[PDB]
Every structure is written in C-alpha cells, then in structure tokens.
Amino acid sequence: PIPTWARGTPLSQAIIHQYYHPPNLLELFGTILPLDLEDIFKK
C-alpha cells in the first residue's frame, strides 16, 4: 500500500519540479549544529 505520490507519474513530476525549481535549503532545513555526543549516546 505505497502512497500515490511516491510512485509512477506523481513522483517523476515531483522530482522534475524539485530538480529545475529547487527551494532555498538553508531556510527549509536550517544550520547543521554540531553533534552533541553526551546528549545522543550512552556512557
């Protein structure tokens, strides 16, 4: 039961749009902040 968007025409259309008309990435995903190892992992 794969959603309509992630298959056939709907996806190729979405990829084509994303390729030729990409968004500002810095505004979409923000600044990559340093990985806090004490916060993320055990020990």
Added chain:
Amino acid sequence: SPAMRRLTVDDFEIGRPLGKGKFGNVYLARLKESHFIVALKVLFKSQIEKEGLEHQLRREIEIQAHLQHPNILRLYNYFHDARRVYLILEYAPRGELYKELQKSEKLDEQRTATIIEELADALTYCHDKKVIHRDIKPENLLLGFRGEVKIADFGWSVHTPSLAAATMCGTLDYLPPEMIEGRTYDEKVDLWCIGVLCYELLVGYPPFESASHSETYRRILKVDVRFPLSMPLGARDLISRLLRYQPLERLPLAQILKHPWVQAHSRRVLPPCAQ
C-alpha cells in the same frame, strides 16, 4: 521558519524503502509542509555505539555543515530519537551507479567522461579542504536526475580495507600495489581508482579481475592492463597514465580535468541552485 527548524519524524511522510545499509535502512520521504522529497536514513544508535563510530559520525556532520559539492551527496540536516539517529539526505533519483552499469552493460564515452570530470572535481575540492571522502567505486557512487555522479558521503562507515575482504568482495581491482603490499598510501590512491572506474564503466568489468585470486593479484602488481581493440584511444591513454605502479607518476587531478579525451566527451553541467 525563523531560526528554529528543529525537525522530527512527525515532520515527514514516508513513501517506500529505498534499500538496506549496514547500520540501517533508507526510506524515500517528503516534508509534510513543503512536500520536498529527501532520502531518510534511519541509523540504530546501538549499532554505531557497538562499532565505536561516535567521533566518525560527529566528523561527518561537522564536514557536511561546512562543505558542499554537486557531486557529493548532501546531508541537509539530522535529528535523533531515544533509539534512532535520522540523516535527512539528498535523494538520488537514478539510484546506484553499479546497478545502472549492469543494466547498461557498458557506458558510452559521454556518460563515462562526464563522471570522470565530476569525480576529479569533487576530489580536488575534498583535498583542497583537507577532508576524508568515501573511496570511489561504482557501489559507493549514486546518480542524480540527469545522471550526475554523487559520492555517497565523506566515508564515516568506511572500514580499514582488508586484503582478504577485497579478494572475496571482488573489489581487489580498486586497491593499488602500495595497499596490496605492506606499504604506506596517501590520496594518490584516488588516482588509481579513477583509472579502474574508467576501465570498468567503458568495458563492463574491472581490468584486473579473473577466475583465480593469485592471477588478479599478479596482474595488479605487474599493472597487466589489457584493452579490448574496440576501446577508444583517448580513454586507453587516460587509464594508462592513471594505472601506474609508481604513485608519484600518476596523472594528477588537475590534468585529468585537462586530459584531451575528457574535454572531447564530457557533458558536465551543474544542477540548478536557488538564491
């Protein structure tokens, strides 16, 4: 979006499994709000702890937060759960290069020379900025919407390559004599691999491969390269100048870009950005 943009799994709609990595699976997903398609890689925290790659992963994030290149697959950002670490990665619509090669049997001079320049460039960038990168070979390379080569990452999950492993994996070809023997190796190894990669893409199989392991071993150390007479002369030349026993006389990156054959057949074009 002011200056917060902290993401969770609740911010994504999940589409389909794209494949299984060593540490965890990669799912095609899109942001709910913007509908921007990404490749979501789900790491098991317990697996990166087991392998002692806490620092390596930190370094991957630090590199990808400072460096960008159109022929190195992008990390947009990451989040983490109690159990999981999520990497939001650039989606490669045309998948794995090795898979495209088997389907194509061989790549024409155009697609091959376009990759070789793209890679030579990405690697010049990587050595200028003094950073490690994922060793180059068809398995480790992904493809953009117009077949732009993407180095999968800056090689944090890369394991110290074993002679025995490479023999069994059938990846002995991408190991130069220095590595094969006890001897010290630098980023001049990169030059050899591009030579191997170029031969593989054009012919369909790695130059040194055989039926015997001792044979493949002998052919590498004697650099016994054998070109099919159907091989374009320009290409034979480039591979002859890259696949040399002596590391210090291997055609440098600056001159792979300038090599006549590349010039004549490369159709490299940057993918669209915003600003």
